[PDB]
Amino acid sequence: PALTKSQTDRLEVLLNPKDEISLNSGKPFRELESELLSRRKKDLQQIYAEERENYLGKLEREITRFFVDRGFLEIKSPILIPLEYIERMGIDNDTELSKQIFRVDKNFCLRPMLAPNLANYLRKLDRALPDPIKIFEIGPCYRKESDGKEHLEEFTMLNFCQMGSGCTRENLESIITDFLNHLGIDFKIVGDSCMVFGDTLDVMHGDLELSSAVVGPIPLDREWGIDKPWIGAGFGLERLLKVKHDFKNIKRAARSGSYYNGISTNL
Amino acid sequence: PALTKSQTDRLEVLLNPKDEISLNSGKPFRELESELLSRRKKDLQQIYAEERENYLGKLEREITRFFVDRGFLEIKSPILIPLEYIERMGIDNDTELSKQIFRVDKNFCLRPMLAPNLANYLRKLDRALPDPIKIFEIGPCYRKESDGKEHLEEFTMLNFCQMGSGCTRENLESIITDFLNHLGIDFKIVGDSCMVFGDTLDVMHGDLELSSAVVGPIPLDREWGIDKPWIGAGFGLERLLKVKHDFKNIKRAARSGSYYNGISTNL
Numbered sequence: 001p002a003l004t005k006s007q008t009d010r011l012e013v014l015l016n017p018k019d020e021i022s023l024n025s026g027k028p029f030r031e032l033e034s035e036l037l038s039r040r041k042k043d044l045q046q047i048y049a050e051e052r053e054n055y056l057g058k059l060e061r062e063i064t065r066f067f068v069d070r071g072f073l074e075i076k077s078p079i080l081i082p083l084e085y086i087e088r089m090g091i092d093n094d095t096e097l098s099k100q101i102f103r104v105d106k107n108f109c110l111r112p113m114l115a116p117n118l119a120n121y122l123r124k125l126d127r128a129l130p131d132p133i134k135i136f137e138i139g140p141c142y143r144k145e146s147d148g149k150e151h152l153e154e155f156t157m158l159n160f161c162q163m164g165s166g167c168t169r170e171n172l173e174s175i176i177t178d179f180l181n182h183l184g185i186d187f188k189i190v191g192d193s194c195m196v197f198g199d200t201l202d203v204m205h206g207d208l209e210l211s212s213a214v215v216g217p218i219p220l221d222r223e224w225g226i227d228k229p230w231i232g233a234g235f236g237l238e239r240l241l242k243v244k245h246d247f248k249n250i251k252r253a254a255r256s257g258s259y260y261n262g263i264s265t266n267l
Numbered sequence: 268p269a270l271t272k273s274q275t276d277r278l279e280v281l282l283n284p285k286d287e288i289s290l291n292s293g294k295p296f297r298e299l300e301s302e303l304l305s306r307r308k309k310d311l312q313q314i315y316a317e318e319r320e321n322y323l324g325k326l327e328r329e330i331t332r333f334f335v336d337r338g339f340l341e342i343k344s345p346i347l348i349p350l351e352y353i354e355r356m357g358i359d360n361d362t363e364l365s366k367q368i369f370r371v372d373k374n375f376c377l378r379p380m381l382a383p384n385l386a387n388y389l390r391k392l393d394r395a396l397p398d399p400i401k402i403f404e405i406g407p408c409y410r411k412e413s414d415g416k417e418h419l420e421e422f423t424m425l426n427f428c429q430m431g432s433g434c435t436r437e438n439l440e441s442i443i444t445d446f447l448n449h450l451g452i453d454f455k456i457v458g459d460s461c462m463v464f465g466d467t468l469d470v471m472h473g474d475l476e477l478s479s480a481v482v483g484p485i486p487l488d489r490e491w492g493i494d495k496p497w498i499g500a501g502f503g504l505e506r507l508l509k510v511k512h513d514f515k516n517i518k519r520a521a522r523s524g525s526y527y528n529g530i531s532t533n534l
């Protein structure tokens with residue numbers, strides 16, 4: 001019993017991390033497929049009977065509660081943003097991130113990050129709210145990618161940020177630590193750099209980048225009317241789910257018609 | 268004291284429905300503006316101190332709990348969808364809704380409704396789950412609009428639907444009724460029609476359309492592999508918020524950097 005590539009692909013779609021089933025165990029495709037179909041139907045029936053919550057939606061709600069309870073204001077800002085935000089973010093037209101932008105109409109695009117909208121909120125809210133200003137947003141972001149096991153074209157970003165007092169490296173690391181401890185995810189912090197922000201603190205789980213974080217001020221602040229110390233971090237929710245559920249491919253965690261909570265919908 | 272159009276616009280931005288303040292009361296602009304700025308800063312400070320939840324996010328969470336508790340599976344599907352879905356939905360290239368579509372790249376668009384993704388889920392889930400199949404989704408949808416007091420280009424749709432047993436007009440009306448009673452919103456049902464679905468039951472609050480709902484089957488089902496009775500309804504969350512909070516302009520409820528929970532962010 002040698003399986004074709006098409007057969008192995010079909011079994012891999014139906015296989016879940018908790019299965020102790022090897023596709024090369026010598027059993028024929030028909031028996032492996034029947035067993036996995038039965039397991040996945042049972043898994044989906046259990047979700048439908050007892051849970052009914054989508055992993056991405058449930059994780060957004062859990063993260064929302066965590067940040068609201070710690071004094072951060074919940075933001076919901078536009079997903080369709082001016083293309084001018086990309087240039088004012090310092091993303092020059094010939095840079096790598098600029099090629100990843102999904103253009104809409106003529107002057108708009110799908111946001112590839114939450115940062116510009118949140119910078120506008122920090123500036124505006126600092127005229128009305130007491131120091132420090134603490135805000136966060138969770139929602140869809142978009143980048144054209146080569147599509148590996150760790151990138152999606154449509155993903156979900158969390159960005160939390162603070163402006164004013166308490167905007168230090170140690171406070172930023174403390175929030176990241178409390179957040180990932182709340183989710184039960186081990187991590188380390190490594191130095192890296194990017195073009196928008198300069199140096200970042202990257203939050204790594206093994207070789208998987210969970211977040212890039214920044215301690216301001218940076219020279220870019222002036223173009224956004226930011227004139228105080230700030231800290232912020234952006235996390236991909238699908239990457240968090242990939243770690244939590246041991247998914248081999250991030251597509252299992254994505255907005256999709258092909259998987260529900262990591263279970264194939266082709267049953 | 269006659270106010271210019273620019274001055275009146277500024278005061279209208281700062282005015283909230285609960286204020287018993289008339290912009291034509293004869294008081295000068297400087298006093299009306301100072302009073303309203305003070306009220307709105309206080310309102311925002313109270314939210315920041317005591318609540319911190321965004322109206323759109325909080326309403327999504329409340330609706331999610333309502334449908335999950337009543338046996339509907341929570342869906343999060345792609346916002347960027349194939350342009351082919353628009354033609355297979357019967358939206359011919361020269362129709363009115365087709366002109367409202369935001370195109371992305373060459374073969375994709377921003378979804379103007381949730382229905383096609385949910386039809387795919389109904390079909391797929393019917394192979395695995397017991398009758399009846401009950402699902403819902405909340406999330407961003409996009410339409411180019413003339414932009415009045417009731418339309419946004421970027422809005423948030425709820426669509427709940429069911430396939431199999433219990434897919435009758437009376438059950439559909441009963442779910443709509445239980446849902447709007449839960450939110451405390453009065454309504455009536457009127458007959459209307461649209462091009463995708465044919466006859467609809469429109470859910471009206473006064474002259475404001477809160478939802479269009481459909482009792483299947485319809486001939487379009489075959490193009491989506493739907494072969495059982497079904498019911499479904501789509502609601503705009505920003506319209507629900509407009510009713511709940513007596514907003515004069517739906518922009519107060521939208522994803523925005525210009526308003527937070529209906530309060531101007533230009534303070």
Ligand SMILES: Nc1ncnc2c1ncn2[C@@H]1O[C@H](COP(=O)(O)OP(=O)(O)OP(=O)(O)O)[C@@H](O)[C@H]1O
Nearest residue numbers: 143145150151152155209210211212234235236239
């Ligand atoms: N295409 C993508 N798919 C899924 N998640 C992503 C994607 N791009 C970024 N993220 C998540 O958003 C976070 C903040 O975005 P950032 O700009 O730092 O990404 P990045 O450094 O380009 O990530 P990578 O180096 O893996 O491409 C990332 O740490 C990651 O968790």
Ligand SMILES: Nc1ncnc2c1ncn2[C@@H]1O[C@H](COP(=O)(O)OP(=O)(O)OP(=O)(O)O)[C@@H](O)[C@H]1O
Nearest residue numbers: 410412417418419422476477478479501502503506
């Ligand atoms: N541009 C929009 N902005 C905000 N909400 C909308 C918009 N278009 C539709 N909705 C909401 O989505 C629901 C379902 O969409 P549907 O296709 O029935 O809208 P519609 O009949 O085009 O609405 P209208 O007649 O007001 O344009 C509507 O009843 C409404 O609550």
Ligand SMILES: N[C@@H](C[Se]CCNC(=O)OCc1ccccc1)C(=O)O
Nearest residue numbers: 113115118119161212221226232234
């Ligand atoms: N690291 C993540 C995003 Se982190 C930015 C936190 N958001 C924020 O409010 O910054 C204020 C700010 C932003 C730009 C210019 C001046 C001031 C990423 O690369 O996608």
Ligand SMILES: N[C@@H](C[Se]CCNC(=O)OCc1ccccc1)C(=O)O
Nearest residue numbers: 380382385386428479488493499501
């Ligand atoms: N009235 C709202 C959307 Se209502 C559709 C409910 N969703 C669903 O699952 O329908 C099954 C289905 C859909 C199309 C073709 C065949 C079968 C609007 O106009 O935006």
Ligand SMILES: [Mg+2]
Nearest residue numbers: 097143145151
């Ligand atoms: Mg990248």
Ligand SMILES: [Mg+2]
Nearest residue numbers: 192202209212
């Ligand atoms: Mg990186």
Ligand SMILES: [Mg+2]
Nearest residue numbers: 194209211212
């Ligand atoms: Mg990074």
Ligand SMILES: [Mg+2]
Nearest residue numbers: 364410412418
């Ligand atoms: Mg319309």
Ligand SMILES: [Mg+2]
Nearest residue numbers: 459469476479
């Ligand atoms: Mg209508």
Ligand SMILES: [Mg+2]
Nearest residue numbers: 461476478479
């Ligand atoms: Mg309608």
